[PDB]
Amino acid sequence: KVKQDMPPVGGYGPIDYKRNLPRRGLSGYSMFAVGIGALLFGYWSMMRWNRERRRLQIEDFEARIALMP
Amino acid sequence: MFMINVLTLIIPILLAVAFLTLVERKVLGYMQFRKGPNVVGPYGLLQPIADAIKLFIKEPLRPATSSISMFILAPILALTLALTMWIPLPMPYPLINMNLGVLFMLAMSSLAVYSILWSGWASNSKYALIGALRAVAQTISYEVTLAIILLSVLLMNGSFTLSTLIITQEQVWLIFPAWPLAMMWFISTLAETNRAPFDLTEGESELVSGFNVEYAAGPFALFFMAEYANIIMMNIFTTTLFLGAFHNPYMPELYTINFTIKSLLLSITFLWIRASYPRFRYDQLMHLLWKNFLPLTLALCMWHVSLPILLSSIPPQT
Numbered sequence: 001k002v003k004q005d006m007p008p009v010g011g012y013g014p015i016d017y018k019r020n021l022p023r024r025g026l027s028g029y030s031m032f033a034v035g036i037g038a039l040l041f042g043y044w045s046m047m048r049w050n051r052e053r054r055r056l057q058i059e060d061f062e063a064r065i066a067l068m069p
Numbered sequence: 070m071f072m073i074n075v076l077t078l079i080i081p082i083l084l085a086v087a088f089l090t091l092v093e094r095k096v097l098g099y100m101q102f103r104k105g106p107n108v109v110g111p112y113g114l115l116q117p118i119a120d121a122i123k124l125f126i127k128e129p130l131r132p133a134t135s136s137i138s139m140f141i142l143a144p145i146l147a148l149t150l151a152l153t154m155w156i157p158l159p160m161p162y163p164l165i166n167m168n169l170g171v172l173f174m175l176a177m178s179s180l181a182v183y184s185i186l187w188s189g190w191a192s193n194s195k196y197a198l199i200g201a202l203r204a205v206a207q208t209i210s211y212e213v214t215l216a217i218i219l220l221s222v223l224l225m226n227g228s229f230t231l232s233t234l235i236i237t238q239e240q241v242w243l244i245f246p247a248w249p250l251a252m253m254w255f256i257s258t259l260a261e262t263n264r265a266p267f268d269l270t271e272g273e274s275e276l277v278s279g280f281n282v283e284y285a286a287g288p289f290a291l292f293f294m295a296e297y298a299n300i301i302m303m304n305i306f307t308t309t310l311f312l313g314a315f316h317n318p319y320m321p322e323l324y325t326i327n328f329t330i331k332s333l334l335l336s337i338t339f340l341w342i343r344a345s346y347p348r349f350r351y352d353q354l355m356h357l358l359w360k361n362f363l364p365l366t367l368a369l370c371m372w373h374v375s376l377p378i379l380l381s382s383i384p385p386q387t
């Protein structure tokens with residue numbers, strides 16, 4: 001008969017050993033640019049809302065002071 | 070009626086601790102690419118009751134304490150603090166509405182370390198002493214920093230009420246006006262609990278939790294309790310402080326839902342961080358805090374003392 005030992009048609013195809021750890025492109029300083037940007041949004045909006053809340057504050061004190069007598 | 074309120078507050082935080090430990094074991098399980106407990110009950114919902122009544126029933130086990138006072142003091146203190154911390158947390162409504170508030174939580178959180186001094190003190194084992202002193206050191210050093218953060222991020226509220234916080238959050242989450250200080254305060258919340266990276270450990274190490282986690286059996290189910298419950302807290306107090314939902318009155322359970330979801334997810338992130346990273350060595354930790362956090366906190370703070378007066382929006386104390 002023939003022999004049943006293993007090796008097949010040669011090569012088993014290619015195999016990739018070498019190291020790969022790629023792909024993060026979002027990082028220049030521009031990460032700072034987007035974060036600091038987010039701050040620049042927060043202070044804008046929050047500024048507005050605190051102004052509004054002061055307006056309400058004066059209005060409430062007006063309620064009280066009109067009550068006082 | 071009022072004791073009904075108390076019970077409805079404190080019983081569900083205990084059940085929350087048990088089923089929390091469940092979710093911990095599972096999330097770490099799959100995060101580790103392996104199923105968590107399935108074989109206690111269906112899907113793992115009977116696992117806490119196992120841990121509970123067993124871990125209660127294993128016998129007291131050692132040693133002569135040398136102080137009968139402290140040994141039965143420290144657990145009572147650790148719990149009592151961990152339970153009363155939950156009082157002011159806003160919810161739709163606080164269950165005690167305090168004018169000061171958040172600095173009351175800060176204060177009791179500062180008291181929480183006597184359980185470590187005394188707990189580690191009554192061991193009579195001179196090694197567990199040293200370990201305890203050190204854990205007190207790191208907890209205390211991060212009681213420095215955190216306080217300054219609250220004293221900053223609050224300065225956009227204008228008052229301590231802890232209710233008006235939900236009023237500031239209406240337009241924009243407080244994470245946007247300061248993200249970085251919120252980042253530092255998240256890691257600060259990792260500090261006291263000593264979740265990884267900040268945990269101490271078994272094998273070879275200072276082994277503070279060696280005798281601390283070993284000793285006192287059932288009362289270790291207590292220190293266990295106050296530690297996890299305290300975790301759920303700091304997650305919730307994060308969810309309230311640095312973000313939040315819109316409160317629609319006439320239907321508070323809406324805000325309660327959204328609040329709950331974000332808080333739970335946050336705690337999930339604790340348990341999976343603990344999975345994720347190694348531990349710092351001790352000194353590199355302590356003077357990692359002293360090196361970098363505290364200076365930048367000072368900078369951001371003074372920048373939040375000077376900022377609101379710049380833009381002319383300074384918050385409306387009621």
Ligand SMILES: CCCCCCCCCCCCCCCCCC(=O)OC[C@H](COP(=O)(O)OCCN)OC(=O)CCCCCCCCCCCCCCCCC
Pocket residue numbers: 146149150166167168169170173180
């Ligand atoms: C051998 C040891 C034996 C003892 C063991 C004790 C174990 C537990 C220890 C930790 C617990 C400490 C609890 C401290 C509670 C402090 C409460 C507080 O400061 O509340 C602030 C709040 C302010 O109210 P405000 O919002 O301004 O106004 C309401 C509307 N006008 O205030 C109020 O609303 C007014 C509340 C006044 C009520 C009386 C307070 C008495 C406190 C007694 C403390 C006794 C224990 C001392 C701590 C021991 C620590 C080891």
